[PDB]
Amino acid sequence: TLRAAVFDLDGVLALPAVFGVLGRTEEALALPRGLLNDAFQKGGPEGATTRLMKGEITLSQWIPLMEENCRVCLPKNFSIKEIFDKAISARKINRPMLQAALMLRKKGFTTAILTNTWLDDRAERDGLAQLMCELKMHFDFLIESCQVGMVKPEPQIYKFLLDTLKASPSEVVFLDDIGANLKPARDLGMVTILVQDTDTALKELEKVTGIQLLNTPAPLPTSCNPSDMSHGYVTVKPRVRLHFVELGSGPAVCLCHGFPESWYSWRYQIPALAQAGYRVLAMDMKGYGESSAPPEIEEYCMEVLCKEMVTFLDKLGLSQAVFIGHDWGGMLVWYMALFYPERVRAVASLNTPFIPANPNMSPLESIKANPVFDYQLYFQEPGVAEAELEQNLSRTFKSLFRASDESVLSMHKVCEAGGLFVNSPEEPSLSRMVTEEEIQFYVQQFKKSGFRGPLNWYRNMERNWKWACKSLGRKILIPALMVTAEKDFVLVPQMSQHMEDWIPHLKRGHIEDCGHWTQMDKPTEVNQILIKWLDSDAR
Amino acid sequence: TLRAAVFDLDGVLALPAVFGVLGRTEEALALPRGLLNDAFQKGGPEGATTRLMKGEITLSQWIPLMEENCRVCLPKNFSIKEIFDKAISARKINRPMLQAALMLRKKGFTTAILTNTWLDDRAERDGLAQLMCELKMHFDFLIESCQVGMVKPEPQIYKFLLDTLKASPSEVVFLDDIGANLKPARDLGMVTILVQDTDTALKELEKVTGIQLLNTPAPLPTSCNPSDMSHGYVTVKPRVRLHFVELGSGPAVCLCHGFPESWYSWRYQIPALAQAGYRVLAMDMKGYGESSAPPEIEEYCMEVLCKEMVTFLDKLGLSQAVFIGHDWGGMLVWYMALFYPERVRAVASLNTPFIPANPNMSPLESIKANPVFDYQLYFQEPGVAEAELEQNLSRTFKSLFRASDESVLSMHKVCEAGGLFVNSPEEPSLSRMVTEEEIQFYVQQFKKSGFRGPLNWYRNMERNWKWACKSLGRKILIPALMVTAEKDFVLVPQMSQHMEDWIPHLKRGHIEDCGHWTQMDKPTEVNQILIKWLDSDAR
Numbered sequence A, B: 001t002l003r004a005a006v007f008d009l010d011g012v013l014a015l016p017a018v019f020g021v022l023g024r025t026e027e028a029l030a031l032p033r034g035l036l037n038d039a040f041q042k043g044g045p046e047g048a049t050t051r052l053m054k055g056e057i058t059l060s061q062w063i064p065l066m067e068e069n070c071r072v073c074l075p076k077n078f079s080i081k082e083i084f085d086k087a088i089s090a091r092k093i094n095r096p097m098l099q100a101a102l103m104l105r106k107k108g109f110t111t112a113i114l115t116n117t118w119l120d121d122r123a124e125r126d127g128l129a130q131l132m133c134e135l136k137m138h139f140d141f142l143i144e145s146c147q148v149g150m151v152k153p154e155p156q157i158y159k160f161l162l163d164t165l166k167a168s169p170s171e172v173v174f175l176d177d178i179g180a181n182l183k184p185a186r187d188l189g190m191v192t193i194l195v196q197d198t199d200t201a202l203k204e205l206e207k208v209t210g211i212q213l214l215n216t217p218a219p220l221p222t223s224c225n226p227s228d229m230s231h232g233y234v235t236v237k238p239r240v241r242l243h244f245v246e247l248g249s250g251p252a253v254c255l256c257h258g259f260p261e262s263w264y265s266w267r268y269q270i271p272a273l274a275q276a277g278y279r280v281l282a283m284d285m286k287g288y289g290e291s292s293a294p295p296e297i298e299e300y301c302m303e304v305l306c307k308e309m310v311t312f313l314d315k316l317g318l319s320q321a322v323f324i325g326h327d328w329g330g331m332l333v334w335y336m337a338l339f340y341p342e343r344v345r346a347v348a349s350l351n352t353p354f355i356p357a358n359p360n361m362s363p364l365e366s367i368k369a370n371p372v373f374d375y376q377l378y379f380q381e382p383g384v385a386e387a388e389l390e391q392n393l394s395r396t397f398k399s400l401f402r403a404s405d406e407s408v409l410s411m412h413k414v415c416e417a418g419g420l421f422v423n424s425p426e427e428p429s430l431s432r433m434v435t436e437e438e439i440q441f442y443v444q445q446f447k448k449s450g451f452r453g454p455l456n457w458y459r460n461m462e463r464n465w466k467w468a469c470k471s472l473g474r475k476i477l478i479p480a481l482m483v484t485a486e487k488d489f490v491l492v493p494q495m496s497q498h499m500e501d502w503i504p505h506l507k508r509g510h511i512e513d514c515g516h517w518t519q520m521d522k523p524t525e526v527n528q529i530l531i532k533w534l535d536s537d538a539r
């Protein structure tokens, strides 16, 4: 039975192939047929191309050698450099091929990329570096000819492949677009697939593995494995350290989760935003995960939380970041925009609207007026909600993290009922949004500090109201995005209806059939909305 | 006696002032004198400018209000927006004023910036954000009118200042360029300085504090306080985690220290390179500080160290970084350029030359041929150098870290003498390069793993030679910088003489009167050379 799948890069995981560029160049320049593809393979195993592929020489050293092999006289302005630059640049990931490799790995397969490639020292080498970065992360192994000093079709590279896989040949599927490179794998006893068009190749792959790879439902975006992330720690004041996970390069994007969450609530956004060209900083907010959790209520007022986030930027040497928040994180991000506009490149909130403080009413009065905000009154008394939320962590997270159609907690008459989970099962079912392993990650994070620091975010109503009143004459004039979720029955879309009075240039996003837990309920759509907005408004 | 110094921003720590822009605009546009400066101060304490300065409104809301106050009819293409944008943009740090504030703080003074400023939401706000970032880091406090809701000359802001300083008025020097804003500080009993030209202001400051501030020797670049840095951690494989310190935004610059050092050996470079527009990642190399230190010799061969640095980039989501190394770090960086050019944006080495492996001689033979490399033979036997280096850490670092004229260790006949420190004092004097506190930082770092992992870097001669021989047909064609140190008697400048044969486009730097410990011996010159090279060759 098959347990490993091997993919070539050129013409398999990445399209169009280079062989399908030299042929097109010959045609465009009306040169004799196969001239360029012959100069490319001249000298065979002893030629300049084999030396390049084995890592003996770099791509920039290979360019003049390819020109000599090319020397029916060639045109006036010919450049092997220009042809190869354009070819490499045009080559993109073959998304359905990658999707099939992802599915096989998800089902227990060991996956690998085996490729005849070069050491790229061209001034434009970053393009290919980025491509390989994106692809390699999805595979157990990447075997490059220039790094191993062996090339396909040499029999040694196939034995090297089997040794790295720790598998017998009959346990391996080998996909390649070059018949000659497929030949040694077959002779060894491996299942082989000659890749011409992707669809046929995947039909052959589905037939041999017995796993559905074609016509499959839309896959979820790439997630995060906590142990594979870069973890950052900044002391913002003597007893307060902030933890964050960091991925990517480009403009800084600071992700701020809500209650009772984690940096991990952004797991589907972190790889997507980094791939989109941003440096993502996903915070554990004060009171959570690996960040400090002081017990004092006042340590969690918006004024102090915002000051600490400014100190966080100061210590990392960041003059600005784009701030994206959800729930309490969304509230924080609007206040960062109002009090520290110079430090905020742009601001986006998921679910949480911007509603100016009412100076003519106490915040307690305003919360009491809306039945859906009853849970916030239940959270007021120190110790009550901590005891209910800390009693059984697995039950807490399984009851909370549910999609709109999954018997979501009721939040009216929480005080009258005497708790959030009083009418909830002791062993709730697992939501379609989360795996048991994801629930256990939140359980392990909350074992450190519990719910005191997180609940304290709700315990500064009067303090936050007095601070917010200082901003009543201001408008938000920096780039801003409000994302509403149709089925969030607490942070309803309608609550955001007057935002343009205070944020005149506001841009919007709206997600249908989306509950409170936006990032994990609808990850693909969140990613689409945020990336589109970042690329147009945040640079 | 004075113990606190307070500085204004506009016209004191930053020049030219905005008052010295509205006057110049009037003159350039032939408008009546004081017209613009009158429209700017219209309504006095009740006017639009006071509201802006107290934080009631933002700068973008203030622009139309300033235009109404401006409304001898004004020209056709007038813009308050364009005038203020250009004014803010032209304003730069007043370096001798900053240098005096730095000296007072170094001598025990509490320093603060007290400024009438605004909430900047202009599309160009980052310029001012960057300026404030750079300035604020050097002071104990930053008091901004728009954040405190109080302005100079109101008496409340001065009482607020004294409260934040925790000092009596007679203990405070207050420097301001506006006579009216100086008046309330004087009436309170503070020493005041009316700042017109910097030199006169500093003569007055020197006279009142009794500290030399003018005509002082060239100051050292800003250093790092370990507890104020962002600390990052990446697991590169099951038992190996790499620690790094991170500062700044822009292209990634990876700093790789030598033996027996730390990320802290780059303390003078980290703030300078981040300020220059780069994202600095200063590593604790494998075997050091907070990075993992496995005991096996093979874990420290160049092939594995380089593979781990590629994994480090992969996990951080970086397609490339510029790699800058010193000593063993310099050796690593040349091999990163040779084996992973696609991942190396540019490469620079301090002291360590690039010398291709000799396939016709064993590396032991080559090291034996040069008397200055004797210490490397002494480092071969596992346990011998560990015992001598670990016996007294303070003695180890004080004996090693010395400038060229400070009885530097002799490195010939180390084996014959039976150790590095056999002819060295038990209590060496402190080098001019280091403070006792800096020595104690290295002592504390080396208490975790000792010298086994670090010494193992020298213990892979044959392994590194076999790997390097695979690269003999290659050239380094990516941007490269070689920095030589005149007085490094081991890694002599002459050893780099043939580098252009293998790196034809090589750029150079040379530092006179510089020993082996380049970064701390000559920090200002290292910073100048690296920043100039980064800005021209690394983008």
Ligand SMILES: Cc1ccc2nc(N)sc2c1
Pocket (backbone or CB within 6 Å): A259, A260, A400, A408, A409, A489, A490, A491, A515, A516
């Ligand atoms: C804190 C919070 C807010 C909204 C919400 N909506 C749910 N269905 S559970 C829940 C929890």
Ligand SMILES: Cc1ccc2nc(N)sc2c1
Pocket (backbone or CB within 6 Å): B259, B260, B400, B408, B409, B489, B490, B491, B515, B516
């Ligand atoms: C490891 C090493 C290399 C050069 C050197 N030069 C000195 N003066 S101490 C020292 C130590």
